[PDB]
Write a protein that binds this DNA or RNA. Structure first.
Lengths: 218, 416, 990
DNA sequence: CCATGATTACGAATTGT
DNA sequence: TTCGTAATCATGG
């Protein structure tokens, strides 16, 4: 838990100890990207760009990833919707309720559960322009993903096309499963069985299962 | 991935890992292939001594409760689990047993999924039960099921203990008298109700004694076991030839021996001597005679006979001449497929009971001469392989193997 | 309405079609759109039992299906192959449909389209206007391709259009990135359909402070402010970044035929696109011929290493010469300048000397026919010329003669008369030129950029990419754009499908394929006697034809684990399976327990693989003859392309027979081919070695017995030749592999060796060999030093050459470009190799006197260098790329750079290419035993002056040098003794 | 015992400045 | 997919 300073905004980034040994590289790759990003307004505000560095990587086992943050009303925490209006979080909550057998539910937060980390592959996006900052973030995304891959056990991808060749992007071979499009037509995501294989391998990795119901909000 | 077949296969791997057994070659090969498939498709994957606690050898106070007592017998032990073949401790090789007991054991195992494996005791072609291993069902209920099929069951005692009890030697004697079993009692395994850990008791005592000589006795169809005699004439049971050779016994010498209340057994030599197994094997062979060759766990004859071997394996009547032999072979209709689905070399090997590895190694190092699709002459090419005395005995017996091979080829041509 | 095809490309939208781009005689461009279906092959009963009837079905007749799965056999009672003869049907489904018992499922849809419709991808056709409907300007729609392409016409010449481009960016310390470094220059070469060639170059103005722009405009350049006011005929134009990128986007959007760039898919195109996006939101758009699909440019990747490709859908071919050269043929280094050195070379004569200049003249009477013309053509835009493969010179004036050239260079005088000219390295550091930016520097970089842009064109005609593309598309039955993008397993499905349809057979594998699990050593390395080279005439295809080695003609595989069964099986094999009808090939057993493995093949009916190979060989021979009997340039180029394509497709069969995911998988056939090839090679090596030439006769070392079975030919070892009586020569055999055999002759007269080699080739082909096995005399090698075929150096004389001929300096295996070895080590290797080649021609060299002499020379040089310390530090400087993407804990190099950053005001980033060397206190004497070296590496900057309290480790560099030298040479004990005496370690050979 | 031998890991051979 | 150097570990002469 320390802090570092940037010439451009946020002008201050606070980070955890686990993220220390590569975080320095980040700032070197940031001063050449920062000037161009701030030209257009982005969601969320720059002050929440690096708040996901807070969750330590020692006590996590599974990783959930998203290609882009929420285009509107972004808050910083990936896959978070306090009002429960986004289609992706609605589908995730419905699937979790179906799998766990719980009929009455109100909300779901993936950051509450211990063992899973809510992560976004691109850390910023322009409102009304989905995936409009891939070139800006590419190197930072590769760096952070290679670091998080060294601590998580199984990596569950979202989006068939977005992460199609994810094996080549990461040099270290790590147990990885790719998921389908969260809002795929023909109810393709309904038949997905990723949560079962995830904890099957997690047990196979000599690790305790993950209580999904912990993320529920009542 | 979308289908649940992959996750079914994954839990199959998890169950196999939960019941891993390196002895089964087929199971190990399948597990390795599945591991390779998993690490290639997913780019990565995360992948009976421990079942027994420390043996008790001194009297001690026991916890009051309900216990089940089962004698552990002296003899070779086998374990059979569902989905794998039978396993023998140490090397984990295979053996041939009748299919009826195979079906009975399968019917016993598939009834309750909690039975990990079943324990078999073999001593001089005698198969009996010792104990059962199940995490959900106590063996007491399945003794009835095993006896229902006709398969033999041991003597179990269910005793409830109220106060503190001392497991003194007198208690062991009372328990043994309560069992009243003719077969030797090598130890006593007793289990507490509701506990997955099963534990055994074995009191030990050792001394020195003089053996007059070591003999061998007939057990059946080319199966023999060494027998040791002493000055007092008492009989000492021997586990196998392996125990004899690894115990470093010496003829007309005092040796240290283990005793129980009813019988005495030789034990392993734990000294730091420089004796070599190779010369010990030939010394034991010379003491017992050059007419013997070891089939692994036993000894066998080298008798010529020649023709009184195919009738025994074929389970047909006695044969005198070639023509009547062919007629009697033709008159049978059921055994034919065994002749029609199996080769000639292995058939002759089984008829004369030769070892697989030994004979296969021998026949690859010495040359033949074939005429008219028949064996006529043979001669050794490299003489180093003769260093093993078993090789020499097999070479001496090879003169009858060639003749029986010629006769089998003759009758095979005659039938077809 | 005669059209010649150019390209076929597919549309990847919601509705998918196929496109034909064609040109007429006048020069008009025509696009034709076809609907693309899914093709399936079923049996008659399966066709009659489909609940929704197929969209269209076409009969194919009676086909025979054979199961080509292999089963072992521990006996000789083998079950026959099962064959099923039935009527077969071909069906077309607009959408993907699954059929449980569909057959022939390993062929592409496009190949089915071509073969069913009877259309070659690049033929000339007289189309029919009845079946074409106009939908736009230049885009038509067709519904019945079978009747529209009925008429075939002889080919007719058409024009074409090309674009070549090059980029020059700004950089100071590291490789440029889009976010910090702008574009300084861009160069374009443009060829339109009118046949007129234009060259132009755009220069940035932000590094051109106003006075410099004004002086340039007065000098003769042009200044523009908007997009509309650019004219192409002006050679040099000054403009800003925005307008330069706009012009680049405009140029990349036209409907060209070939946009060729050297490594442009990874750097150039990506750089332009990203920089344009950052400067303005405007982005490049490609549109389909029907104006229905619009896509953006995004380079994607394919892992074959990684090769980049463009997502264009307008029909243009974005070609990258780098990947083509990488996958076409093998070089030492794949740099642009290296390829230019290997491609454009000549020899010239010196006509003038004095001062710091020299005049070179070049004509066809000096090197060959066409070399002078090519060198002169490249000389138009050239700047620097490489001379003697050693020096780099700056061109001051050049004059192209009527049938030659003359050039004046700034080079020192040399004591010779004929020298070698080539185009190669450039002695220019661009970082320094960007530091002090002035108009002269800008103009000179403009000239460099235009020469770089044109070099791609010159290479494009040198390699014959167009004719090879057309030939490959015709032979493989594939679209043009994908001729040079797929591996061997894909370019073989067309001819295989055609052969299967012609023979009316289907091969099925109704099981699963379990994954079942040599280096040649020359006898000696230093030779000093002449070596004759012989090339086998396609050993594997010919021997596959000889043995009928096909999956469907394998009678069986018999294995035996014991001598009993092996002997009985061999006896029954010779009894029931007799020659010459059948053939039996031994193989290495596939399991440890097996001791014998025999595969049996039948020669009664010809197989499928032998038929394909025979067709390939016959076509190649016919095209060789047609090229040899031709006079025009276009016909010669076409015939060369055809023969090359047939050669490259006929040499991929052996590899595909050993590939699990191939359509020609055959384990037994592969092992049989390898074993029989080894047998033939061993037989020839045994029969050549020791064969002498006495009187007018030649005797071989062994009887000419056939190594397979009895033959009716005479087997007399003595053969009567027609060479002069007095000749008495003895031959030796040293090296031999699949594609070549080396023979040793003890003489130095090249003419006699050449004539004897020709006569020996004739005698071997006519008498010694049999059936379709033949050899060809390739070259004569002198001064041969070789570890393997990967690494060797020698002088090469062609077969058709005399004593007074220019040698070919062959040298490969060594890279000479490894920038982390040394500057001193390279020079020592070169001088010692030259001395070796000089003493290897004396005449009295034997074996154990060269080693001692070279060792003594190395002694003298190393001790003199150690005791002199006269070498400058810059010759002992090594370099390394800095990147902290390291595993493990410390990796002291990171510690060293961090310490240097802490202790010096100069800062090193994470992309800077930094220099380092070995320095120690000067008081330490010579050390034999070696210790860790990473702690003795120090980083040297520009301002570092070597203090008197420190010196450099001569011992480390000397150990590396002597290891590389000891890698050569024959004797072993002397070399290891020397190495132990000097450095006290064990040499690491090989 | 320790020279000798054999494993393991490193990183350019990269290409475009 | 290659090879070649350097540091480490391990074994029979």
């Amino acid at each position: 838990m320390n802090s570092v300073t940037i010439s451009h905004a946020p002008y201050t980034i606070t980070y955890h100890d686990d993220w220390e040994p590569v975080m320095s590289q980040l700032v070197e790759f940031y001063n050449e990207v920062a000037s161009w990003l701030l030209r257009d307004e982005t969601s969320p505000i720059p002050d929440k760009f690096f708040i996901q560095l807070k969750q330590p990587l020692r006590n996590k086992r599974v990783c959930v990833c998203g290609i882009d943050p929420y285009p509107k009303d972004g808050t910083g925490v990936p896959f978070e919707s306090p009002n429960f209006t986004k289609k992706s979080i609605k589908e995730i909550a419905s699937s979790i309720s179906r799998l766990t057998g719980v009929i009455d539910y109100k909300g779901y937060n993936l950051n509450i559960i211990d063992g899973v980390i809510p992560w976004n592959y691109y850390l910023s996006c322009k409102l009304g322009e989905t995936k409009s900052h891939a070139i800006y973030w590419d190197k930072i995304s590769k760096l952070l993903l290679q670091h998080i891959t060294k601590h998580v056990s199984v990596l569950y991808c979202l989006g068939k096309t977005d992460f199609s060749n994810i094996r080549a992007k990461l040099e270290s071979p790590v147990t990885t499963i790719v998921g389908y499009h969260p809002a795929a037509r023909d109810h393709q995501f309904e038949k997905d069985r990723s949560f079962e294989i995830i904890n099957v391998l997690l047990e196979l990795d000599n690790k305790t299962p993950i209580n999904w119901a912990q993320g529920f909000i009542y | 991935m979308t289908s649940s077949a992959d996750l079914t296969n994954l839990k199959e791997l998890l169950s196999l890992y939960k019941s891993l057994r390196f002895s089964d070659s087929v199971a190990i090969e399948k597990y390795n292939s599945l591991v390779e498939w998993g690490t290639s498709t997913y780019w990565k994957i995360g992948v009976i001594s421990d079942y027994y606690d420390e043996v008790k050898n001194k009297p001690f106070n026991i916890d009051p409760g309900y216990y089940i007592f089962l004698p552990v017998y002296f003899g070779s032990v086998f374990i059979y689990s569902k989905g794998k073949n039978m396993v023998e401790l140490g090397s984990g090789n295979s053996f041939q047993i009748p299919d009826e007991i195979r079906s009975a054991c399968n019917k016993v195992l598939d009834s309750d999924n909690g039975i990990d494996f079943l324990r078999f005791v073999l001593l001089n072609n005698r198969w009996i039960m010792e104990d059962a291993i199940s995490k959900y069902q106590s063996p007491v209920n399945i003794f009835k099921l095993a006896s229902e099929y006709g398969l033999n069951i041991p003597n179990y005692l269910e005793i409830e203990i109220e106060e503190d009890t001392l497991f003194d030697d007198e208690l062991y004697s009372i328990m043994e008298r309560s069992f009243d079993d003719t077969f030797p009692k090598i130890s006593i395994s007793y289990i507490k109700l509701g506990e997955l850990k099963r534990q055994v008791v074995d009191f030990f005592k050792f001394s020195f004694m003089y053996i007059e000589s070591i003999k061998v006795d007939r057990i059946g169809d080319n199966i023999f076991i060494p027998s040791v005699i002493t000055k007092s004439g008492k009989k000492i049971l021997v586990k196998d030839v392996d125990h004899l050779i690894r115990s470093k016994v010496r003829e007309h010498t005092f040796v240290k021996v283990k005793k129980k209340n009813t019988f005495s057994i030789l034990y392993d030599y734990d000294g730091n001597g420089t004796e070599t197994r190779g010369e010990v094997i030939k010394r034991i062979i010379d003491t017992i005679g050059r007419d013997y060759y070891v089939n692994g766990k036993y000894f066998s004859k080298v008798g010529i006979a020649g023709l009184k071997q195919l009738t025994n394996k074929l389970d047909i009547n006695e044969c005198a001449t070639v023509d009547e032999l062919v007629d009697e072979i033709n008159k049978s209709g059921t055994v034919k497929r065994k002749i029609k689905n199996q080769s000639v070399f292995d058939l002759s090997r089984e008829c004369l009971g030769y070892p697989e590895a030994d004979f296969i190694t021998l026949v690859n190092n010495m040359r033949f001469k074939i005429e008219n699709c028949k064996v006529v002459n043979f001669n050794i090419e490299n003489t180093n392989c003769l260093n093993n005395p078993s090789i020499e005995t097999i070479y001496g017996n090879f003169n009858q193997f060639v003749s029986i091979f010629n006769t089998v080829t003759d009758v095979k041509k005659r039938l077809f | 309405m005669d059209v010649r095809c150019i390209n076929w490309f597919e549309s990847h939208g919601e509705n998918r079609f196929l496109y034909l781009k064609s040109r007429c005689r006048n020069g008009e461009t025509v696009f034709i759109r076809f609907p693309h279906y899914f093709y399936y092959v079923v049996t008659d009963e399966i066709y009659q039992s489909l609940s929704p009837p197929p969209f269209n079905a076409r009969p194919m007749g009676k086909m025979r299906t054979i199961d080509i799965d292999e089963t072992i056999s521990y006996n000789l009672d083998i079950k026959d192959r099962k064959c099923s003869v039935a009527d077969m049907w071909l069906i077309e489904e607009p959408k993907k449909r699954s059929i449980q018992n569909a057959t022939m499922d390993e062929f592409f849809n496009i190949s089915w389209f071509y073969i069913s419709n009877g259309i070659s991808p690049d033929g000339c056709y007289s189309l029919d206007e009845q079946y074409l409907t106009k939908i736009n300007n230049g885009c038509y729609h067709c519904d019945d391709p079978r009747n529209c392409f009925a008429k075939e016409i002889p080919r007719f010449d058409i024009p074409r259009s090309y674009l070549f481009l090059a980029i020059a960016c700004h950089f100071d310390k590291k490789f440029p990135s889009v976010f910090i470094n702008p574009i300084s220059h861009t160069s374009y070469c443009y060829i339109d359909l009118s046949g007129k060639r234009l060259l132009f170059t755009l220069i940035n103005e932000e590094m051109l402070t106003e006075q410099e722009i004004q002086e340039a405009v007065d000098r003769g350049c042009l200044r523009i402010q908007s997009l509309m006011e650019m004219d192409y005929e002006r050679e040099l134009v000054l403009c800003s970044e925005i307008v330069l990128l706009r012009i680049a986007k405009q140029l990349l959007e036209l409907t060209f035929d070939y946009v060729v760039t050297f490594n442009g898919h990874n750097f150039d195109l990506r750089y332009i696109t990203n920089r344009l996006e950052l400067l303005t939101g405007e982005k490049i758009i490609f549109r389909s011929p029907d104006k229905k699909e619009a896509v953006h440019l995004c380079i994607y990747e394919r892992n074959q290493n990684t090769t980049f490709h463009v997502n264009n859908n307008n029909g243009t071919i974005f070609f990258d010469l780098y990947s083509f050269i990488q996958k076409s043929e093998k070089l030492d280094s794949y740099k642009l300048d290296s390829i230019s050195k290997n491609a454009f070379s000549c020899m010239g004569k010196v006509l003038n000397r004095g001062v710091r200049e020299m005049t070179f003249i070049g004509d066809d009477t000096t090197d060959a026919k066409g070399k002078a013309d090519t060198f002169a053509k490249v000389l138009t835009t050239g700047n620097y010329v490489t001379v003697d493969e050693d020096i780099i010179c700056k061109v001051i004036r050049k004059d192209i003669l009527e049938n030659g050239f003359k050039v004046v260079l700034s080079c020192p005088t040399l004591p010779n008369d004929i020298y070698k000219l080539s185009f190669g390295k450039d002695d220019i550091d661009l970082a320094q030129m960007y530091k002090d930016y002035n108009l002269n520097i800008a103009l000179d970089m403009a000239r460099y950029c235009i020469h770089d842009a044109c070099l791609c064109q010159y290479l494009w005609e040198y390699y014959g990419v167009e004719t090879k593309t057309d030939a490959g598309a015709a032979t493989y039955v594939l679209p043009q754009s994908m001729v040079f993008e797929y591996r061997a397993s894909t370019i073989i499905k067309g001819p295989l499908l055609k052969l299967l349809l012609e023979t009316k057979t289907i091969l099925v594998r109704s099981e699963t394929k379990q994954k079942f699990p040599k280096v040649f050593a020359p006898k000696q390395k230093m030779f000093s006697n002449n070596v004759l080279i012989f090339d086998y005439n396609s050993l594997y295809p010919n021997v596959c034809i000889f043995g009928n080695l096909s999956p469907e003609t394998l009678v069986g595989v018999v294995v035996s684990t014991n001598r009993l069964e092996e002997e009985i099986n061999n006896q029954l094999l010779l009894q029931k399976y007799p020659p010459p009808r059948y053939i039996t090939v031994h193989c290495e057993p596939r399991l440890p327990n097996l001791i014998s493995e025999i595969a049996i093949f039948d020669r009664s009916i010809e197989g499928t693989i032998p038929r394909l190979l025979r067709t390939f060989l016959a076509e190649r021979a016919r095209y060789k003859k047609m090229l040899k009997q031709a006079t025009s340039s276009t016909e010669k180029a076409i015939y060369d392309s055809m023969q090359y394509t047939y050669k490259i497709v006929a040499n991929s069969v052996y590899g595909l027979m050993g590939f699990r995911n191939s359509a020609l998988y055959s384990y037994a056939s592969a092992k049989s081919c390898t074993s029989i090839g080894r047998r033939m090679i061993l037989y020839l090596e045994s029969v050549l070695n020791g064969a002498e030439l006495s009187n007018g006769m030649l005797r071989f070392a062994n009887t000419l017995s056939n190594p397979f079975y009895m033959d009716d030919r005479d087997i007399n070892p003595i053969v009567k030749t027609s060479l002069p009586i007095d000749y008495r020569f003895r031959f030796r055999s040293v090296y031999g592999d699949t594609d070549s055999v080396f023979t040793e002759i003890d003489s130095q007269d090249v003419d006699k060796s050449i004539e004897i080699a020709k006569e020996l080739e004739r005698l071997i082909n006519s008498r010694v060999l049999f059936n379709n096995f033949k050899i060809e005399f390739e070259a004569v090698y002198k001064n041969l030093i070789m570890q393997s075929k990967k690494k060797y150096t020698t002088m090469k004389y062609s077969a058709s050459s005399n004593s007074k001929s220019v040698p070919e300096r062959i040298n490969k295996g060594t890279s000479e470009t490894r920038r982390d070895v040394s500057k001193f080590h390279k020079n020592m290797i070169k001088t010692y190799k030259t001395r070796l080649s000089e003493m290897l021609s004396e005449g009295r060299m034997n074996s154990n006197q060269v080693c001692i002499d070279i060792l003594r020379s190395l002694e003298t040089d190393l001790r003199s260098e150690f005791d002199s310390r006269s070498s400058p530090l810059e010759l002992f400087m090594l370099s390394r790329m800095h990147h902290s993407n390291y595993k493990s804990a410390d990796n002291p190099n990171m510690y060293l750079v961090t310490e240097y950053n802490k202790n010096n005001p100069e800062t090193i980033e994470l992309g800077e290419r930094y220099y380092f060397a070995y320095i120690c206190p000067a008081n330490v004497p010579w050390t034999k035993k070696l210790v860790n070296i990473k702690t003795y590496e120090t980083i040297i900057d520009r301002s570092f002056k070597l203090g008197s309290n420190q010196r450099i480790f001569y011992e480390v560099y000397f150990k590396r040098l002597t290891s590389e030298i000891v890698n050569l040479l024959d004797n072993k004990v002397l070399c290891i003794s020397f190495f132990q005496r000097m450095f006290g370690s064990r040499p690491t050979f090989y």
